[PDB]
Amino acid sequence: NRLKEKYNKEIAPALMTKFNYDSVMQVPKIEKIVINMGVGDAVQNAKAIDSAVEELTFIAGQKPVVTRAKKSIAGFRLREGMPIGAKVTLRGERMYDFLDKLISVSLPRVRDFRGVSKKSFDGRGNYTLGIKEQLIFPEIDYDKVTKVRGMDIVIVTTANTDEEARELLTQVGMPFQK
């Protein structure tokens, strides 16, 4: 909750002076994060896609749900049924308890990483990010999982423009390649 108090006292007042706001009260707000698994099956016979689903319980406490395909693909499995990947939509106090782990711990842990996200902005608001290691998340043990599985994060901004959406992220302490 320390991150949650942080924008209630530090970020917002500074954000208010950076440019004018209609009706004073208006301020961009984080909405939902969506973590993707993908897995890739390779090919369909994981055999246990659910074993990957258990792994995501560590990255976030919200229960993952498998994303069943709504369309068949000629190049890869499969027609509808036998779900591929998983999805999570953490909210509330969980939102900043998770984001606090992201800046302070997750991103710096990565080897080659120093900073990203420049062209990444939609020009509308939403942020996107890729995650390629479970070593990135401290709660996971090294002994578990063995083979690497992919991950994603998508922060949402209330702001109607990326110029406002970006400035909100900078005060959060989010890294940028610059």
Binding site: R111, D112, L135, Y142
Partner: protein, 119 residues
Amino acid sequence: ARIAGVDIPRDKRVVISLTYIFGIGRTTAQQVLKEAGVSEDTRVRDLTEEELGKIRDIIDKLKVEGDLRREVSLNIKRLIEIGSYRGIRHRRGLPVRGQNSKNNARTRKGPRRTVANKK
């Protein structure tokens, strides 16, 4: 995982255990352990709660995994944009140091295959 060089193994003595680090080799490990005074110690992984940290600092002075990969990468990229001839050998599949090509030198060339006959 891990405290110094990332992903050092387990159930092995500390010297070979950090030779695996992309940076330190054998003799360099002999030097950092000479600074350590560990005496080997420990066959498995059990060093000491704080000594692991002070060794983590000395290893931190040495540099550095994937960035060291960036050193060689930026170096060869410096060796190709420069003209060149050395990076030219780097991408011909030609050995760079200078050791013919009429026989062997398959380290870059690969195995298969063959496309000639006479007569």
